[PDB]
Ligand binder design. Structure first.
Ligand SMILES: [Zn+2]
Ligand SMILES: [Zn+2]
Lengths: 343, 348
């Protein structure tokens, strides 16, 4: 029952989130108007996506993706990484960001940021400012004061209606969970490229991950009014909040982010697909088997990207050995001591 | 005696023979579409609604193709509280659409549009002399012009003219599609956001059509997403539909008193049975006899009480007294109970 008490404060109330929704929505609208106006290279920019823009267990933290349809691209995998690609064109206004024969991500992102910095300064109604360029952030972040501090990440992305790259052929292993009809439909949706050398883009499946979170059960009536409740989402909130609180205390956990937890629980939902395996009456058992699974990913240094199997997030090149051991010690400490961090 | 699984073996379609008929039925439909998209034609923007889907469930001979027309500028009006039949008008004075040629006053005439639609198809069916296909005679109950192809295998192709409206579904369907405790509320909302359709047959009335929705439900019939998939458990929902549909088709072949009943009655009764018994375990292949019998008992209960509501329009009773006489229901009930009690001799 202790975990249910922690979830009681982690659930977003619709009243406090609605005042932020009204503020975030209109600011993104005004930014979208300007991108479609005058002589900006981002004329056909549209928003990708309410509760979808909010970060799950992070109140008043928001994500917005500005997609740009580019149907004239030719992808080239960058050094067999599977996730990073160089974009080329077969046979126009995006030539300003072209560097030789490859479209520069840094040139487009820097110009994309100048247009956002000019509009945030032309706004004097709500007091909003642009972050300084973070090292690991392609998005342009906005600090909105409500007076409640609100952060909104504006991610520039390229939309491609073509087929998903070959590196995702064995990705999305939901055949024994969400089924093959769902997998075929999801893979027929477009895929996205966000900047991350300076001219390489990385694949983004935020739209697909959003669908899986809202359609997580093997039964269609899962977590509905006329259906059974499960604790899949509750285990994700507890696991994400545990890692967030651990990053607040120790700077040694900088190499870990929320997407590792999200990736690890997707594999758990694939390994344990049955809705009965995530009964809310067994929340402590479900959260512990998720912890044990995450610790196995840390100690074996194996956490494959759920869409790109060849790409290992916990590889030795990405995260060093001392950080994984450090995180493993802290996770085992709270796992045996009743999780004192939640207090 | 596992006689039901023997009937199903002879009833399943041979993919070798259904693929040959698929190649010829598509290219003929493609040619008809090409002649529709041409200049001087009121059906310029016509399209196909949907290879393997177009063949009927228990009928390998017959195929069904719907030619839809987007009409984002029409207003609907119920025709005497029927729920299913409507008169089609325009929101304002029409200017840019050629469909005003079929106006019978302020109401879009179905017989006017269907006649010109059949004139165009009968022109192209007489132009083609390489495959030998003819347009069937005028049947009263069918708005679709039927194409009879000799492959030499005789195959029927119903070309159904339909209007596509992407607006909200009419209020007669508000309490229809009751799949909340079965396929879920998310599925129901997504289905109700797809367009709805109107088919012809006062000669200006149009009937609602949910063939696109009924097709989704057949291919997504399980409460579990993996139902009838490779990595999932097989159920017998579709097998009971085929047996029940084939039982009525064989009874209609033998008795002319069953002209009032059609396959849609079978299709409607099983959608209710799937709502009444939503669990995939209630449709286990080991219980094929139990599932097919409890379906027959449900269909006999609909004949007895003379109530079979349209699965999408609750107020529309398909077994109403003004639609089917009690003698036809008593006669169908007598014949079904005979087959149910004597091991179904008609299957032989
Ligand atoms: Zn659930
Ligand atoms: Zn099934």
């Amino acid at each position: 029952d202790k975990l249910k008490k922690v979830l009681d404060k982690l659930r977003l109330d619709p009243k406090d989130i609605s005042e932020a929704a009204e503020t975030v929505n209109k600011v993104v609208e005004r930014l979208l108007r300007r991108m479609q106006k005058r002589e900006s290279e981002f004329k056909g920019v549209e928003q990708l996506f309410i509760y979808e823009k909010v970060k799950i267990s992070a109140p008043n933290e928001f994500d917005v993706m500005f997609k740009l349809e580019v149907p004239r691209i030719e992808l080239q995998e960058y050094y067999e990484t599977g996730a990073f690609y160089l974009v080329k064109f077969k046979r126009n206004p995006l030539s300003h960001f072209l560097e030789g024969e490859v479209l520069s991500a840094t040139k487009m992102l820097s110009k994309f940021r100048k247009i956002i910095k000019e509009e945030v300064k032309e706004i004097k109604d709500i007091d909003v400012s642009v972050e300084k360029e973070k090292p690991g952030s392609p998005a342009v972040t906005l600090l909105i004061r409500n007076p409640e501090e609100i952060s909104v990440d504006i991610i520039l992305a390229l939309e491609s209606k073509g087929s998903w790259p070959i590196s995702t052929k064995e990705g999305l292993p939901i055949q024994g969970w969400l089924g093959t009809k769902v997998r075929t439909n999801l893979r027929r949706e477009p895929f996205y490229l966000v900047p991350k050398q300076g001219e390489t883009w990385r694949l983004s499946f935020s739209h697909t991950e959003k669908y899986i979170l809202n359609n997580h059960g093997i039964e269609k009536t899962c977590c509905e009014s006329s259906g059974a409740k499960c604790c899949r989402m509750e285990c994700l909130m507890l696991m994400k909040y545990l890692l967030e609180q651990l990053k607040k205390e120790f700077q040694e956990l900088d190499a870990f982010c929320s997407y590792h937890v999200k990736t690890a629980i997707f594999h758990m939902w694939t390994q344990d697909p049955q809705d009965s395996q995530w009964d809310p009456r067994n929340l402590s058992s479900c959260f512990d088997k998720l912890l044990a699974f995450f610790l196995e990913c840390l100690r074996t240094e194996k956490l494959d990207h759920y869409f790109i199997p060849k790409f290992n997030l916990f590889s030795q090149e990405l995260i060093d050995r001392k950080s994984k051991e450090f995180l493993s010690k802290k996770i085992e400490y709270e796992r045996n001591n009743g999780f004192p961090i939640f207090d």
